[PDB]
Amino acid sequence: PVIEANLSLNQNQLASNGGYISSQLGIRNESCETVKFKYWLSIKGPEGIYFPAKAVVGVDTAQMLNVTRGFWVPEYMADGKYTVSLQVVAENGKVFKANQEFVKGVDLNSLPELNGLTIDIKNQFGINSVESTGGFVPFTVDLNNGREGEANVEFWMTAVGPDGLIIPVNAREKWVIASGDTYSKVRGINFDKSYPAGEYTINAQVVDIVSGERVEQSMTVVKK
Amino acid sequence: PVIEANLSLNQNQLASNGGYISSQLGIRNESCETVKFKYWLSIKGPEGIYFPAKAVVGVDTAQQESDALTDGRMLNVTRGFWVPEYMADGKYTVSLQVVAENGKVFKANQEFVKGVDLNSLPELNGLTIDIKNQFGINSVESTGGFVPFTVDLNNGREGEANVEFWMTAVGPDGLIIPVNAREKWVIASGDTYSKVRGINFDKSYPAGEYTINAQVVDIVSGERVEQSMTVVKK
Numbered sequence A: 001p002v003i004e005a006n007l008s009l010n011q012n013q014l015a016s017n018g019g020y021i022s023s024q025l026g027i028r029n030e031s032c033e034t035v036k037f038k039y040w041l042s043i044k045g046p047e048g049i050y051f052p053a054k055a056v057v058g059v060d061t062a063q064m065l066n067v068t069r070g071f072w073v074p075e076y077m078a079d080g081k082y083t084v085s086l087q088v089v090a091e092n093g094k095v096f097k098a099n100q101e102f103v104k105g106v107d108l109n110s111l112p113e114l115n116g117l118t119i120d121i122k123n124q125f126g127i128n129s130v131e132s133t134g135g136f137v138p139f140t141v142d143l144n145n146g147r148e149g150e151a152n153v154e155f156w157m158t159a160v161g162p163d164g165l166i167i168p169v170n171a172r173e174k175w176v177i178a179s180g181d182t183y184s185k186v187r188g189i190n191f192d193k194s195y196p197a198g199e200y201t202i203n204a205q206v207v208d209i210v211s212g213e214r215v216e217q218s219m220t221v222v223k224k
Numbered sequence B: 001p002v003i004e005a006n007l008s009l010n011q012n013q014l015a016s017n018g019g020y021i022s023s024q025l026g027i028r029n030e031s032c033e034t035v036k037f038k039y040w041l042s043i044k045g046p047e048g049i050y051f052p053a054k055a056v057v058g059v060d061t062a063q064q065e066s067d068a069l070t071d072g073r074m075l076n077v078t079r080g081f082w083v084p085e086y087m088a089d090g091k092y093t094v095s096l097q098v099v100a101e102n103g104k105v106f107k108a109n110q111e112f113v114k115g116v117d118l119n120s121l122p123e124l125n126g127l128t129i130d131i132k133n134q135f136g137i138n139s140v141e142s143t144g145g146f147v148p149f150t151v152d153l154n155n156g157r158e159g160e161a162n163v164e165f166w167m168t169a170v171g172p173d174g175l176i177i178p179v180n181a182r183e184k185w186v187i188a189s190g191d192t193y194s195k196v197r198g199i200n201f202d203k204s205y206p207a208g209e210y211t212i213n214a215q216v217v218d219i220v221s222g223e224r225v226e227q228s229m230t231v232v233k234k
């Protein structure tokens, strides 16, 4: 209501050598009162990458904003899925975020994979938040071995949340999956009443034991 | 008071091929009434690894069950986990975490390392990364505070290093706040690059835990090392 943030990327797909993404940042204040805020632009990626694109700027809307900022994604950074985040904090403490994705070295609109073993992990019903009094979110997990041979995989899930919490969601499992078979399950987490308010990254990890390659899938759930 | 948690590891140093870590978990109810809680053991690692201590032979089906301690009593429990070779070398943090029924969070942490020495600075093949909370300031008031951090990159290699460096603060409500913009530096052999950089936590920023995350890249080798430090806004 007091702030609306908009984010647009000119490109959503880079090759493995990386490249350049230009972003259009739009911030409007439709409310009746004038408004003070700080904003910035950051990126999150595979293998724990976080990096800034645009530094913290204070803005008094008395003294709609439109800016374009770009950044280089270099080749050394890991191939996979990245999230760009325009973040605004209003003086009153309200947080507004506009997010967009790009990929590096993999196809957008293709499942993440480990050389032919695809990882389809989803928030089953698109449930992005639960009440402070608690709620339960199931996730579907489908590991499809499209290889000619066996896949020897390990799989687990945690919920990385407020107050330094890392809540187990799926214990470590190992499966030898034959050519053409699919390991399939539904796994949910109950956000108990007692868990703290805030943002939880439901973080799934899948490893090929033989190649040693890991892919993560990360999904957000807010406890209100 | 309601809970005191503690954790000890049987070892803190693994080689690159990995190994097995056993741990003793201690949860004491120091308070005067009975306390109901949930607890678990989780590991945080390099390259974004997070994983639970628990491994199961088949399909994990359990849910996170509560336990209860009578006033003055304690739970002594014991847990073990394998660290595979494929997990990245570097520093790992094991965390005993307890959430009480009333919402209070208690934690006890210990570190182990894999394929690098204990008490040695993180490095990229001779280039040494020494980043610290300068004045040991672990929290700030909800009305705001500033925290400076020292950065020292000592190049012990025979040749020059091309590094890229940046810092963010990874916080509550999905915030990733720039602390130090991406810079590239050329550090001669035997040199140290030194700077000081602080973050202002504005009043408006959300309460909770902020991970000050410094990243350093060897632009030539393409290897990256992280350093992270926590600061809580009350």
Ligand code: NA
Residues within 6 Å of the ligand: A152, A209
């Ligand atoms: Na095996």
